[PDB]
Design a protein around this ligand. Structure first.
Ligand SMILES: [Zn+2]
Ligand SMILES: [Zn+2]
Lengths: 372, 372
């Protein structure tokens, strides 16, 4: 396999299905990436993550740089070796969690300094973020950008997008200057601009001029609501280069994924299925359920009637109800495995339906049942 | 397979190795039984418990009767079906945890009434305990006894042992009157008498007159220290019928197990490897380690150099150190799997060494290294 190659096998409207080939493996798109925080997908061995159908996982740079430390992970042989996942890993830049979780935050054109949420002092910059992602041994490296809050005024969205594009060029140059990283990993840029079409366009043009292996739509899933998110995707995704993957960062709920694929998105991540699995929320084709509800206490059916996962093969709603109510670790294990398996089955249905030219019908059928 | 048959294949001094055959499976002795509290061996799927080598698990009646409830479990098809473990299960009587965890405790010759640790009111008696164990679908049912605290005066140890023997007869009669239980499960009696040889003898004689499928040594591992425990086993175990299994309740540390087998014990349980696994304590042939210690932060070796478990095949001390320090669920999963696998490897070495007439040498070699 090559360092990076994205092939599109089939299309339907704006939707695409295909493959990303990388040295560590093939990624089927559209793809869902389970989130590994601190070098673990919560409550799952890597073999179980793979058994659910995942081709790639996401690792959080911020958490890793705090515990166990990026230099330490590099000394120990890299993130893949450390956690026992040998397939591709996409790392985020660390910037988002600096803003959402850290304490200091002195921001500047150079980057950000901050206090860990033991109050030790740390720094991130385009250069240091790219370096940390190298030390982790990331396969897909995210450019370091500045968070644009929602809502944002046009002036502030513009200023922040402009800074992010300067940081995208610095990220590109840092990545390219490190021969081992340039030859073995891929680099994605992040489109900014809040909800403003003109700023989204300027951002896409700047990122395409620099040139990346893939393009994320940043700044969404931050409070805006689905209608607004879809409205922004409607004009934003077509601005990105068609022949590279489009990654919607932090999305999301099953219905958000379906609509985003309808709008040209190829890659997804979110904590939702893992975090909400822990935590009683289980996804089903008839919509989510909360397994803690008393109505499930004697329900012998599996979490979902059709799901092919090992949890649905082997245990009842009644048992999982009991485990989650009792605070048992096995409850978190089982809920997380089922929810990430459900997400992968959703992605497989999306891929097959695009391949077969019946994705619009699938989306309609999916929604009719999920919201019945 | 029969309802119950204990065969002794080989002996060395007081030590024995053999098999218990029951309808749901064969148990190799000496046996270690991982403890399932509330219908789960903490942080492990039943398939993983089996992969470590366990032939039988213990279920805690007290916890089960509170959550999810014994009648509910029976409605749902029994404990085996509910939790997904199809091999034998030994249930305790519930009495111990009434004393250690519950709030009310009004004790009488009839039994005990108590408040749950939501303050709902419950009762246990020989008859109700046997009934609850039936409703759970237990394969090995423990007679309901009275807890003798350590230390105990001779008068109080005698009074309590005498009550326990009256309750042993009531347990026997309750079990025998329920045809389905009598035909499919086994019943063990519990020897009492604190540290007093004469009381231990009276207790053994009373239990043998009633007649049980197996005999537990109760009332130890309660604060007495290893020398005293071994001193009591020295005279107590030979009092029990030789041709039935001898079960030392609540023991214990690897060295306690080796010495107890030297003294004629065939069956063991304890929370130690699971609870202490969570929790940073890992067993090794060179003695226990605490994986949280900073000295392990960059240690690429497995938990134990010889252990054949999947954790030692796949992950380093450094990774598990990180997970436990970070409070990650996967840390509990990995530590628990390794510790229960270590216990099963200990039992296998004990069985093979007795079978080969070299158990005394094994015990000496084991101690020399474990305490080096
Ligand atoms: Zn499932
Ligand atoms: Zn091991």
């Amino acid at each position: 396999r090559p360092r990076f190659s994205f092939s599109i096998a089939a299309r339907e409207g704006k939707a695409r299905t295909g493959t990303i080939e990388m040295k560590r493996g093939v990624i089927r798109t559209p793809a869902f990436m389970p989130v590994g925080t601190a070098a673990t997908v919560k409550a799952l061995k890597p073999e179980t993550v793979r058994a659910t159908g995942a081709d790639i996982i996401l690792g959080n740079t911020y958490h890793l740089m705090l515990r166990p430390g990026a230099e330490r992970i590099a000394k120990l042989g890299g993130l893949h070796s450390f956690m026992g996942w040998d397939r591709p890993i996409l790392t985020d830049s660390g910037g988002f969690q600096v803003m959402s979780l850290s304490s200091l935050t002195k921001q500047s054109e150079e980057g950000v300094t901050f206090k860990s949420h033991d109050g030790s002092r740390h720094m991130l910059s385009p250069e240091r973020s790219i370096e940390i992602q190298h030390l982790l041994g990331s396969d897909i490296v995210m450019a370091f950008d500045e968070v644009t809050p929602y809502p944002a005024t046009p002036s502030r969205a513009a200023s922040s997008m402009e800074r992010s594009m300067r940081w995208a060029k610095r990220s590109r140059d840092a990545f390219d200057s490190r021969k081992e990283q340039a030859e073995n990993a891929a680099l994605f840029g992040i489109q900014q601009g809040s909800v403003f079409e003109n700023l989204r366009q300027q951002s896409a043009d700047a990122l395409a001029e620099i040139g990346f292996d893939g393009y994320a739509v940043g700044g969404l899933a931050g409070g805006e609501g689905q209608d607004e998110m879809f409205r922004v995707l409607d004009f934003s995704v077509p601005m990105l280069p068609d022949d590279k993957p489009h990654y919607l960062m932090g999305v999301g709920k099953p219905d958000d994924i379906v609509g985003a694929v309808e709008r040209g998105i190829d890659m997804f991540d979110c904590v939702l299925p893992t975090r909400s699995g822990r935590n009683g929320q289980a996804f089903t084709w008839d919509g989510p359920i909360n397994i803690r509800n008393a109505r499930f206490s004697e329900d012998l059916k599996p979490l979902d009637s059709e799901c092919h996962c090992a949890v649905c093969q082997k245990w009842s709603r009644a048992y999982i109800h009991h485990l989650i109510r009792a605070g048992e670790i096995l409850g978190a294990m089982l809920m997380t495995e089922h929810n990430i398996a459900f997400y992968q089955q959703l992605m497989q249905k999306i891929r097959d339906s695009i391949s077969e030219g019946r994705f619009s019908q699938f989306a309609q059928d999916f929604r009719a049942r999920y919201f019945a």
